[PDB]
């Protein structure tokens, strides 16, 4: 049956033109692609695993589109936040994310990135308690994480290191996926209290009593006041070798830094891009705080880089670092959406019809995207480009023998007359 696909997308358009909000179209496009992603994936010829991934990718694209256009377009402007110098850093961070839409967009994108991150299954047969092997062998004169750092790592049993590896890797995957609550649960429950505690430093300080404008979200002070310190402390910890590469990786991510080579070598376009947007973000916040004298000089223990990249440049670098992946045609759209250069790319792939015909999803996707765009933002895509796109896709509806559902797509030109 699967050669139903176009129906689903077409179907969604029917429903829209007929209850005469348009963001639902895309939401459905997403779900549609996802549903199809499942079909080709389950039981299939290994020629299908490929086009299955091109559907999952499809789906992620629709999601990213929804998120960003919702934020950008459903922008109806709220009330400005008036801080005082007595206010906590927490509030200033919030203000920053409110006022600077360019940067919040980075947040949105990171959220999307996390959403679609793979995490291993929870490690089984985890041991009763930490470093149990070393303790049992005798030779841990101190039971604290820093003991084998104070003096040769030869202290820790091999099996203990192997388990610490399992743990820190799992925690790392969870952190990259946004699963911070799960990471704290794992830390707690796996007898890694001190690491847990480390994960608690992630929050900026708020006090509901002082920072009135969040006395709703909070009933109790929380987060840590000397955060610039925390951050250097963690970063330095991240640079100290004789720690497991995933643990160092974790601290890197937390300090707004770029994890060690041993770990980073396995990160893909999404993972890598995520890492570097995290860096942009971290740097930008800490700079925002410095420009408002909410950082205390004592805490500038160490040099961290102060110069934030632009999303443009991060993308360019990550691209050159992952050319194969970068060049994939829906991930180009992903980037195009991220930079807003989107009608830009529409008109572009339009002129590539004048090695876009070779891949099937593309001509469809661009067309339905163009439709959505001009629905949500009348004017968005050049009238001509709509004409050209629908023209060509329609002729494929003909080549597929689905003339049945051509009128729906017609509802965008007087050129429709000619059908």
């Amino acid at each position: 049956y699967q050669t139903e696909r176009f129906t689903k997308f077409s179907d969604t358009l029917k429903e829209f033109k007929i209850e005469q909000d348009p963001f639902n179209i895309i939401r459905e496009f997403r779900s549609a692609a996802g549903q199809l992603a499942l079909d080709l994936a389950n039981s299939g010829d290994e020629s299908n695993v490929i086009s299955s991934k091109d559907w999952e990718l499809e789906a992620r694209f629709w999601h990213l589109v929804e998120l960003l256009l919702v934020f950008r377009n459903a922008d109806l402007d709220l009330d400005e936040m008036e801080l005082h110098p007595y206010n906590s850093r927490g509030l200033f961070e919030k203000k920053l994310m409110q006022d600077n839409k360019q940067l919040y967009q980075i947040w949105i994108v990171m959220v999307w990135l996390k959403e679609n991150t793979y995490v291993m299954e929870r490690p089984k047969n985890v041991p009763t308690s930490k470093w149990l092997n070393s303790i049992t062998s005798g030779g841990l004169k101190s039971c604290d994480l820093d003991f084998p750092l104070r003096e040769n790592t030869n202290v820790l049993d091999v099996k203990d290191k192997e388990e610490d590896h399992i743990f820190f890797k799992y925690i790392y995957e969870l952190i990259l996926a946004g699963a911070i609550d799960e990471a704290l649960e794992e830390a707690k429950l796996s007898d890694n209290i001190s690491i847990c505690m480390i994960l608690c430093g992630i929050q900026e300080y708020l006090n509901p009593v002082i920072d009135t404008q969040i006395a709703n979200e909070f009933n109790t002070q929380q987060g840590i006041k000397k955060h610039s310190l925390w951050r250097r402390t963690v970063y330095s910890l991240s640079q100290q070798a004789g720690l497991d590469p995933y643990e160092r990786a974790i601290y890197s991510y937390l300090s707004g830094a770029i994890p060690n080579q041993e770990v980073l070598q396995y990160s893909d376009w999404e993972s890598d891009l995520h890492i570097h947007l995290n860096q942009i973000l971290q740097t930008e916040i800490e700079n925002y705080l410095l420009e408002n004298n909410q950082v205390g000089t004592d805490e500038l223990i160490l040099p961290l880089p102060s110069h934030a990249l632009t999303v443009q440049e991060v993308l360019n670098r990550v691209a050159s670092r992952h050319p194969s992946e970068s060049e994939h045609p829906i991930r180009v759209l992903m980037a195009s959406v991220i930079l807003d250069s989107l009608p830009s790319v529409i008109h572009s792939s339009v002129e590539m019809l004048l090695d876009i015909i070779d891949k099937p999803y593309l001509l469809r996707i661009v067309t339905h995207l163009a439709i959505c765009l001009d629905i949500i933002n009348p004017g968005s895509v050049e009238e001509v480009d709509k004409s050209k796109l629908i023209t060509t896709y329609i002729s494929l509806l003909k080549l597929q023998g689905l003339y049945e559902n051509i009128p729906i797509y017609a509802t965008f030109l007087n050129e429709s007359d000619c059908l």
Partner: protein, 742 residues
């Protein structure tokens, strides 16, 4: 404020923060008020000092650049924008500005070229981008022509660029080429809808008529170009009436009437003669629309007299016969002419009706009183100033003979609308108008047929309904959309007049009837489907559509009032219940059940008189005018249970469908009960099979007969039941005749 208000605040913060750094960090907020007090040599030094301490603020740097722009110091203003742009790349509008200013001041340096390239990729093919491309070239005739042509290749729908081509032709005084392109471009559906283009079309043609080149060349094609002028006048008239003011619209009428008078003398039996025929009708129709515009603002006595006058105009237009389509040279030309004919009959048609519903056979009086030649002078009087010569004015010389004075038939009107959907490029304005005009009628419009005429081969329902990606748009989504747009529009206008007829407004005169949000969506999905989007804007258009999909499908956070959902549900059931094929029946019934399944939870909370959680920036405006009441809840639950049963029957759960249908003694349940009992009989009725089974088979056909008779018995007795019929009464009787002859 004044000079004292701002210079006194100096001592206000000077006494609050006296150190030099904080004194200079307030410079931007000092400069914030001098820009308001018209002090630019002072505001400049205030902001410039804040820049001395806050050298990395993109806002401050831009503010100084905008202030140097008022000072007209290009070199200084540009540099300021540059700093704000290099600090923050998201400032697209500043990349245009830099490119805009670099090309205006000096093009000799390639830096102006570079910034123009970036400006292009930030705003794909925007109207300003070409403007800058022409500016850069300015700093030779053949050179300009090649730019426009290369620009028209990829942007043939750009109004401004095509206009420039006519102006370049006109500058070299090769007007024949100017009209030639003007003629070949009147086939473009987009340009035909452009007010400024049609204005250019009217001039370039007239210039050619008087041009020395028109006479010398030949008198054979003279008629051909003359046709386009009339066509242009019609389009230009439609647009001028809507956007322009009372004065400008009336003035355009005089040029139209002059052209008509100058054309009628030639006559003949070719495209020009056929064009004159159809355009003649348009003239009165627009003239009627023009008349109604004046009266709206005016008093009641003038309104009735003017509406009386307009009614005659629309009548004259409607009477005009369908133009002779076969008589045109080409397929494109003839299809166009017919398209306009349908538009004329449709627009004038609904107007004729809405004006005739005011009174009983109001139309008859209009003709019996003003069809007299006295009315012709009363029409010329109200429209024009009597000073103009009444001899060469077409209005005063037309032979108003045997006005049909027959109100239009709905069935004819429907096929006029459907044929004219592409008249105004399917603007949501066009459809929302029609949808509203049918909102007062007893017969409903074929929306699903409208959409098929617009988006051909767009599936009724998309297989991949799971996601909201806008490649899965379906004619149902659109049908569901227009329903809300009209249901929303009607309520909004109802609220307006209540504070202050809504049906009576003609299409040009009325303003936007939908929210700019809705209009943006329709324009997006249209440009996307028809493949007239922009590679750069593809992703934006695509997302704009995606945003609303989840609402048209009643998914997470749908901005849908319960009444609008119910309206969608029943409007799709009855729309589908009348369809012949199973594919369409299933789809429309499916969606109807879907929306029903989303409402019933709301109705149950409403059934116990609780509060519905109001929406956040909904797509379809909520209204307490149609908020559901307990008085109607049990009905919807019942009407929904029917929709459930219908889908159960279509899927195969006949046992549960009949069990449900029989539970409620409704006229519609009869037609369903009958229709499904007939099918169980007909298939088994004639093949060799157990005799006992045959008797049971006949028994079902006996039930079919009975239920159809119950329909007709209850139908003839009461009118309210006639309207509840899921199909026409004559269709029910049609089956019965065949049922009994079986």
């Amino acid at each position: 404020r004044s000079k004292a208000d701002v210079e006194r605040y100096i001592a206000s913060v000077q006494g609050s923060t006296p150190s030099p750094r904080q004194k200079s960090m307030k410079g931007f907020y000092f400069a914030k008020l001098y820009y308001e007090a018209k002090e630019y040599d002072l505001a400049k030094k205030y902001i410039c000092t804040y820049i001395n301490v806050q050298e990395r603020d993109p806002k401050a740097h831009r503010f100084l650049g905008l202030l140097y722009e008022l000072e007209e110091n290009t070199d200084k203003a540009v540099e300021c924008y540059r700093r704000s742009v290099e600090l923050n790349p998201t400032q697209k509008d500043l990349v245009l500005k830099i490119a805009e200013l670099l090309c205006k001041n000096d093009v000799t340096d390639g830096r102006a070229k570079y910034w123009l390239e970036r400006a292009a990729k930030l705003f794909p093919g925007s109207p300003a981008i070409y403007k800058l491309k022409e500016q850069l070239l300015d700093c030779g005739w053949n050179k300009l022509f090649d730019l426009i042509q290369s620009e028209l290749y990829v942007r043939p729908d750009d109004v401004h660029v095509n206009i420039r081509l006519v102006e370049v032709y006109r500058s070299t005084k090769r007007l024949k080429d100017a009209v030639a392109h003007c003629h070949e471009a009147e086939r473009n559906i987009a340009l035909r809808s452009s007010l400024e283009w049609n204005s250019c079309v009217v001039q370039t043609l007239k210039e050619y008529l008087e041009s020395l080149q028109c006479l010398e060349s030949d008198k054979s094609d003279w008629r051909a170009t003359n046709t386009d002028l009339l066509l242009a006048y019609a389009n230009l008239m439609l647009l001028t009436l809507s956007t322009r003011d009372v004065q400008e619209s009336r003035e355009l009428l005089q040029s139209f009437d002059s052209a008509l008078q100058s054309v009628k003398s030639l006559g003949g039996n070719d495209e020009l003669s056929a064009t004159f025929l159809e355009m003649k009708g348009h003239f009165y129709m627009h003239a009627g629309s023009l008349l109604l515009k004046m009266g709206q603002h005016s008093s009641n006595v003038q309104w009735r007299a003017l509406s009386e006058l307009a009614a005659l105009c629309y009548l004259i237009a409607f009477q005009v016969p369908r133009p002779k389509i076969k008589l045109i040279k080409g397929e494109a030309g003839q299809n166009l002419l017919e398209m306009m004919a349908c538009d004329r009959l449709s627009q004038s048609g609904h107007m004729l009706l809405n004006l005739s519903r005011g009174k009983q056979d109001f139309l008859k009086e209009i003709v019996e009183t003003f069809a007299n030649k006295s009315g012709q002078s009363a029409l010329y009087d109200a429209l024009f100033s009597s000073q103009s010569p009444k001899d060469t004015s077409f209005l005063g010389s037309d032979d108003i003979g045997n006005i049909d004075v027959r109100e239009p038939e709905l069935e004819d009107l429907t096929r006029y609308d459907v044929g004219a959907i592409r008249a105004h490029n399917g603007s949501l304005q066009h459809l929302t108008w029609l949808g509203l005009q049918w909102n007062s009628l007893p017969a409903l419009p074929g929306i699903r047929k409208w959409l098929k005429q617009l988006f051909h081969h767009l599936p009724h329902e998309t297989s991949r309904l799971e996601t909201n990606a806008p490649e899965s748009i379906c004619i149902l989504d659109l049908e569901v959309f227009l329903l809300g747009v009209v249901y929303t529009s009607h309520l909004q206008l109802k609220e307006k007049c209540n504070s202050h007829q809504p049906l009576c407004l003609p299409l040009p005169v009325c303003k936007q009837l939908c929210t700019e949000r809705q209009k943006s969506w329709w324009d997006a999905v249209c440009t996307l489907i028809h493949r007239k989007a922009v590679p750069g804007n593809v992703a934006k258009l695509r997302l704009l559509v995606q945003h609303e999909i989840n609402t048209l499908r009643a998914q997470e956070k749908h901005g849908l009032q319960p009444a609008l959902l119910v309206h969608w549900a029943e409007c799709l059931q009855k729309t589908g219940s009348g369809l012949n094929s199973f594919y369409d029946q299933r789809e429309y019934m499916g969606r109807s059940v879907h929306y029903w399944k989303k409402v019933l939870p709301l109705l149950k909370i409403i059934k116990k008189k609780n509060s519905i959680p109001e929406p956040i920036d909904p797509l379809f405006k909520h209204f307490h005018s149609v908020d559901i009441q307990a008085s109607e809840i049990v009905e919807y639950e019942e009407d929904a249970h029917i929709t459930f049963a219908i889908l159960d029957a279509v899927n195969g759960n006949i046992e549960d469908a009949v069990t449900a249908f029989e539970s409620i003694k409704s006229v519609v349940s009869y037609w369903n009960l009958a229709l499904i009992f007939h099918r169980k009989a007909e298939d088994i009725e004639n093949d060799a099979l157990s005799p006992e089974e045959q008797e049971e088979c006949k028994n079902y056909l006996r039930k079919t007969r009975d239920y159809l008779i119950k329909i007709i018995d209850d139908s003839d007795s009461n009118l309210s039941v006639v309207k509840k019929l899921p199909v026409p009464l004559e269709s029910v009787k049609e089956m019965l005749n065949s049922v009994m002859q079986e």
